[PDB]
Amino acid sequence: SAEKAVLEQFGFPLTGTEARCYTNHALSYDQAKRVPRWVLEHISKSKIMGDADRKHCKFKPDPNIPPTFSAFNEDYVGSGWSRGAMAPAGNNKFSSKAMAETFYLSNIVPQDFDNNSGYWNRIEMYCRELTERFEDVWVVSGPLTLPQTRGDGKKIVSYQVIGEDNVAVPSHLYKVILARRSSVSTEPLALGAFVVPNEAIGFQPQLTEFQVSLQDLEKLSGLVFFPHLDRTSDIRNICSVDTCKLLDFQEFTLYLSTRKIEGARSVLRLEKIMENLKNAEIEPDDYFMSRYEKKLE
Amino acid sequence: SAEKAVLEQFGFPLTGTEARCYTNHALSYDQAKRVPRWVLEHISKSKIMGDADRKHCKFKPDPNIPPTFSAFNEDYVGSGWSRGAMAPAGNNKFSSKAMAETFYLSNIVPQDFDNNSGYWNRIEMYCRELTERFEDVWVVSGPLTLPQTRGDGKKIVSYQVIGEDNVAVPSHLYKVILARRSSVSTEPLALGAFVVPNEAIGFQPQLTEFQVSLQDLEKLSGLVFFPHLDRTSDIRNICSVDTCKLLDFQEFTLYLSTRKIEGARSVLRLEKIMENLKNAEIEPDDYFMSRYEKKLEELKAKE
RNA sequence: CGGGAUGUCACG
DNA sequence: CGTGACATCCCG
RNA sequence: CGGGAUGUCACG
DNA sequence: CGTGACATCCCG
Ligand SMILES: [Cl-]
Ligand SMILES: [Mg+2]
Ligand SMILES: [Mg+2]
């Protein structure tokens, strides 16, 4: 192959798409859009429990990404968009290093403010909730810039770029969920693929509304998820063997109020929570009350 | 090590960005846009000569591309865009197999009809012209989807997708040119990078108007070109060492008329080629007349 | 050179 | 329906 | 849980 | 102008 040797004289162009691995999540970086292409993580009940704190971590450029192709906090702040992490920080309570690697900008995309801490947040919580029914949960997340047909019939992909480095703002976010009940069972695996628009949503629509077939998502994203997964074998819809239903307004508001006290140093903060709970029309469940009287010390 | 085996248990997702080598070019395919991301080729005096013929070739899907992520002629035909090859067929006249592999849709992007046959064609000509003065030249070509600033300040990337498979139509096309004078000399290498918009362009714009720096291109494209090339050494702007001058209207149409002499199958057809030249206020060069007189006499015998 | 419109025969 | 190879013609 | 606005000290 | 680790305060 002498002809091939001259062709490679100076080397092929580099795309920087090789898989980058961290202490509890891997990803492939898109050097052109300056966002991750896909982010893989494994969740177990053992991992979502720990002492790693979320406010001792800062969003910073991944020092493994060439600064030329890296994004920076200056691109997000005040751009009208938020820094949305794909590998959730909450999935790494067990390790402080793992949680800190979640805050590398290689793992975050521009995300609607309401969608981030709202609907998408609830999807991230449901993933952690599956750990109580499945010993192993694999999740794959990433951005999407999807087309949209217009009056004259033709389809146009259109997406915003923000900051000096032009970080691509996706029109949708995808999340594939693969769950197996036990390490020693051979139940069919539970699989679910979902595509959510990058915008405020609310509580009306059920997560089933956003479900799509795996092979479809693979077509719109140009990826092949879980190659080693024997597709000839029997695989079942995650939503037929589970709930696929996020927290309602009352549950979500209470969960936040329950977790807000854990970081409430002062007694004044606890007062506001109740005043806000009363302003919310909710009826404080006894669980929150048990975690209310213990922290009044 | 064990907390990783559980991650890889079902494997990482596949991107399909690995290089795919062929007879005279390589490329990395973009499975999401159904177009090549970059296409690398090497050309020389010997490779741009031969008996390989376009008209005995066909556009069709690269068989090494999963049909799921592949483009098909149905996506292009009737979409309002042409099939533009990044690795030119004219750069592989020496091998019938090599030329055939440039018609794989893995080497094709939706390209404006006028652009494909006009300005971009003339750029591919200038690359073949460099083989007269450089023994080896490398070319990287691919598509781009660049942003645009609205009046209100927002920057928007927009591009049409065509066909059922949503093949992306780039806003611009890029080309990186690297030429070394000789394998035994150590004259500084010459490099030029260019970004042309995917629309009709005439004969007034000079190639240097679309020239950019290698850094600027790598930032736009998210690629790094020619990694093993030492960037601290002495590298020259190709448009200073060479001409970066595309053919004007007269010599461009003249070149086409000469290439059409070979395909002339009747004396009357061959004379029509010359009448069109004269109607265009172009006087053929002595090379055309020799070629014209030759093909003429060749066609008179068997008639 | 770069793109297109067509026909015919053979065979899966 | 597709696969090949031979051919005719058009445009810039 | 998920995102933002501010401070004091320390070092390069 | 860049790296680490303390702190209080807003919002859904
Ligand atoms: Cl067409
Ligand atoms: Mg988030
Ligand atoms: Mg072309």
Numbering used by the authors:
A (entry chain A): 56 to 352
B (entry chain B): 56 to 358
Please quote the authors directly.
ExoG is an evolutionarily conserved 5′-3′ exonuclease in higher eukaryotes that is localized in mitochondria. Compared to its paralog, endonuclease G (EndoG), ExoG contains an additional Wing domain at the C-terminus and bears a signature SRGH sequence (instead of DRGH in EndoG) in its catalytic ββα-metal motif. Here, we report that human mitochondrial Exonuclease G (ExoG) may participate in this particular process by efficiently cleaving at RNA–DNA junctions to remove the 5′-end RNA dinucleotide in an RNA/DNA hybrid duplex. Crystal structures of human ExoG bound respectively with DNA, RNA/DNA hybrid and RNA–DNA chimeric duplexes uncover the underlying structural mechanism of how ExoG specifically recognizes and cleaves at RNA–DNA junctions of a hybrid duplex with an A-form conformation.
To further investigate the molecular basis for ExoG’s substrate preference, we next co-crystallized ExoG with an RNA/DNA hybrid duplex (referred to as ExoG–RNA/DNA complex) and an RNA–DNA chimeric duplex containing two RNA nucleotides fused at the 5′-end of a DNA duplex (referred to as ExoG–R2 complex). As ExoG prefers to bind a nucleic acid strand with a 5′-end phosphate (5′-P), we ensured that the RNA strand of the two substrates carried a 5′-P, whereas the complementary DNA strand carried a 5′-OH, to facilitate homogeneous ExoG binding. In the ExoG–RNA/DNA complex structure, one asymmetric unit contained one ExoG dimer bound with two RNA/DNA duplexes. The composite omit electron density maps clearly revealed that the RNA strand was the scissile strand with its 5′-end bound in the active site, featuring a bump on the sugar pucker representing the 2′-OH group. The 5′ end of the RNA/DNA hybrid duplex was anchored by the nuclease domain and Wing domain in a way similar to that of the ExoG–DNA complex, but the hybrid RNA/DNA duplex was apparently fatter and shorter compared to the DNA duplex in the ExoG–DNA structure. As expected, the RNA/DNA hybrid duplex adopted a typical A-form conformation. In both the ExoG–RNA/DNA and ExoG–R2 complex structures, the two 5′-end RNA nucleotides (nucleotides –2 and –1) of the scissile strand are embedded deeply in the substrate-binding groove adjacent to the catalytic site of the ββα-metal motif. Comparing the three ExoG complex structures determined in this study, we found additional interactions mediated by residues N176 and N171—which interact respectively with the 2′-OH groups of the –2 and –1 RNA nucleotides—in the ExoG–RNA/DNA and ExoG–R2 complex structures, thereby establishing specific protein-RNA interactions on the scissile strand. Importantly, in the ExoG–RNA/DNA structure, F168 was slightly pushed away by the 2′-OH group of the +1 RNA nucleotide compared to its position in the other two structures, suggesting that F168 might serve as a blocker for a RNA nucleotide at the +1 site.
